[PDB]
Amino acid sequence: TTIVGVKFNNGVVIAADTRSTQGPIVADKNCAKLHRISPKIWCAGAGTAADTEAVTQLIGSNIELHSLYTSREPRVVSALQMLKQHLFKYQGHIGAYLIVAGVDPTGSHLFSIHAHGSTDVGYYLSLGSGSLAAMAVLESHWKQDLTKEEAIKLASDAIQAGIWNDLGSGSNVDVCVMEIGKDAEYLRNYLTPNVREEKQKSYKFPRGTTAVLKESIVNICDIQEE
């Protein structure tokens, strides 16, 4: 799983791969790994697949409370502090390896956070098992304070380094751009490398090729009057 986060002057760009594994077996060919604390506070996760989404959903609920409660836009900081605090109590038994990103009135942000509430701030951070592959590409092209468009081309290609060499990243590359004092635009399937080729012969079968032991008719209807 290769999930990158690249900060730039105007905002922060968070991308993820859509190959979902369970073991060496591919669970889902295409299922996005991007979640939403708030509109302006997105995150994605690698690690335990159930424990990223539950953690994101729960702290999703508690910032949503707050966001009514202060009667204003929430903040990246608010998500991080509740996340970080939550995860320490369990001592890192609720796994979570999230790039948390977002913009807010108080500037551009880009964090990573680990299972037991270790937190880093960088300009480019990646987590999961494809994290290494990405990171190499990410430390070469970069410079302080990118452009919007430069940041988008480099982030996609960090996941592509992933697709090539980490077996947990495959298929479609989704991107989500967040920029300060404007809407968040989710550019799902920005780069789509590898598509399953057409069958040499389409597989169709005539009927009665599968034999029936017995037949019965059980409908999904409830009971109603005669």
Binding site: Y123, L132, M135, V137, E139, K143, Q144, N165
Partner: protein
């Protein structure tokens, strides 16, 4: 049973149209404590092959002598072919491989990763891999230690496979090697500023340039990380 004692890490390598560039960090790690610096691990064998080794220095040193003794055997007899047709990278690779295989049998292994890379006397580039397991593969770019999943992905952009080699040259390779060595220094705790860069070219032979430094490293965004407070 073997326990790693003094270990070294990171050698990178890639092919290009006329030869290879293999380069390594030099630094003897001893865990988080670092006890040796400038420890060479590009061991030249012949004059057109560098055998680039990582893992234990002790095992590296005991087979460093044996590698020099193969050349000594080759020069025993055959005055017309004491390196000309008695030394190629493929022979030096196989020699190394069956010693590690036999020690995995014992359970008393040579704890290393080994790149053997050079250019043959057929005139064709060579890059193969062996280790303490004693697996074997050929490759178009190759690496060891922490760079076998950091640096190696950066080089796979550069040369995808065994028909992208003539699309790659020595200036484009040189840069790719520089970049890769810089990147290793940031994210590894076991990589330092010294690295030695060896190019084995078929038009100019073994040109071994020693003690190159990392240059154009960025550390000026470090001030714009603030506190948490």
């Amino acid at each position: 049973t073997q326990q790693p004692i003094v270990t070294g890490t990171s050698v990178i390598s890639m092919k290009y149209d006329n030869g290879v560039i293999i380069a390594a960090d030099n630094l003897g790690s001893y865990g988080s404590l670092l006890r040796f610096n400038g420890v060479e691990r590009l061991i030249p064998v012949g004059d057109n092959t560098v055998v680039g080794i990582s893992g234990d220095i002790s095992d590296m040193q005991h087979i460093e002598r044996l590698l020099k003794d193969l050349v000594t055997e080759n020069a025993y007899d055959n005055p017309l072919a004491d390196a000309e047709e008695a030394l190629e990278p493929s022979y030096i690779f196989e020699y190394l491989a069956t010693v590690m295989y036999q020690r995995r049998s014992k359970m008393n292994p040579l704890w290393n990763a080994i790149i053997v890379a050079g250019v043959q006397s057929n005139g064709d580039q060579f890059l193969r891999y062996v280790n303490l397991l004693g697996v074997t593969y050929s490759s178009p770019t190759l690496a060891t230690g922490f760079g076998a999943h950091m640096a190696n992905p950066l080089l796979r952009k550069v040369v995808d496979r065994e028909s992208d080699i003539p699309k790659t040259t020595v200036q484009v390779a040189e840069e790719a090697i520089v970049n890769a060595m810089r990147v290793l220094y940031y994210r590894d705790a076991r990589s330092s500023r010294n690295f030695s860069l060896a190019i084995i070219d078929k038009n100019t032979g073994l040109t071994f340039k020693k003690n190159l430094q990392v240059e154009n490293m960025k550390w000026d965004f470090a001030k714009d990380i603030k506190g948490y407070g």
